Design a binder for this molecule. Structure first.
Ligand code: CL
Ligand code: CL
Ligand code: CL
Ligand code: CL
Ligand code: CL
Ligand code: CL
Ligand code: CL
Ligand code: CL
Ligand code: CS
Ligand code: CS
Ligand code: CS
Ligand code: CS
Ligand code: CS
Ligand code: CS
Ligand code: CS
Length: 129
C-alpha cells in the first residue's frame, strides 16, 4: 500500500506513535517519506547482507527474521514480511522498540540526515488529525 501523507499521519496517531519517546508525528511522517516514500512494500538490501523492510525500513540485522541474515537477531519477534503489510501495526510496534533503544530516531540514518532539525510539522500541516 502506498499511503497518502495525511492518511499515514492518521494511522500512526491511531497506533500511538504521535509524540512517542517525545517525537512528534511530523518526525515519523518525514522518516517514512524518506525511508519508503510511504510504500509499505519497500525493501532494500544492505551491503552487509541484511535487508530493510516496510514504511520505516526496519533492518533484519536486529529487528525481524527473514531467514537470510547470518548472525542477526529478531528483537521485535516478527517475520520481516509482517513489516510489508497494508496494516502498519507491526511496523509501528517494532519502531517503538527501535526508538527506545538508546539513540532515539537517530537509529534511522535518513531521519538524522533529512528530518532532524527541520520544520517537520510541515509533514502534518493541513491534516485532519
Ligand atoms: Cl492522505
Ligand atoms: Cl508527500
Ligand atoms: Cl510535528
Ligand atoms: Cl536470519
Ligand atoms: Cl532475537
Ligand atoms: Cl519468522
Ligand atoms: Cl493501518
Ligand atoms: Cl531521544
Ligand atoms: Cs538500505
Ligand atoms: Cs533505493
Ligand atoms: Cs541497495
Ligand atoms: Cs533504507
Ligand atoms: Cs538469525
Ligand atoms: Cs526473538
Ligand atoms: Cs510481536
Amino acid at each position: 500500500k502506498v499511503f497518502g501523507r495525511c492518511e499515514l499521519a492518521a494511522a500512526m496517531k491511531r497506533h500511538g506513535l504521535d509524540n512517542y519517546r517525545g517525537y512528534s508525528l511530523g518526525n515519523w511522517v518525514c522518516a517514512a517519506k524518506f525511508e519508503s516514500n510511504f510504500n509499505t512494500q519497500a525493501t532494500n538490501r544492505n551491503t552487509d547482507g541484511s535487508t530493510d523492510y516496510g514504511i520505516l525500513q526496519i533492518n533484519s540485522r536486529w529487528w525481524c527474521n527473514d531467514g537470510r541474515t547470518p548472525g542477526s537477531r529478531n528483537l521485535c519477534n516478527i517475520p520481516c514480511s509482517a513489516l510489508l503489510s497494508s496494516d502498519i501495526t507491526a511496523s509501528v510496534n517494532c519502531a517503538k522498540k527501535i526508538v527506545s533503544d538508546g539513540n532515539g530516531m537517530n537509529a534511522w540514518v535518513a531521519w538524522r540526515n533529512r528530518c532532524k532539525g527541520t520544520d517537520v510539522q510541515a509533514w502534518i500541516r493541513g491534516c485532519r488529525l
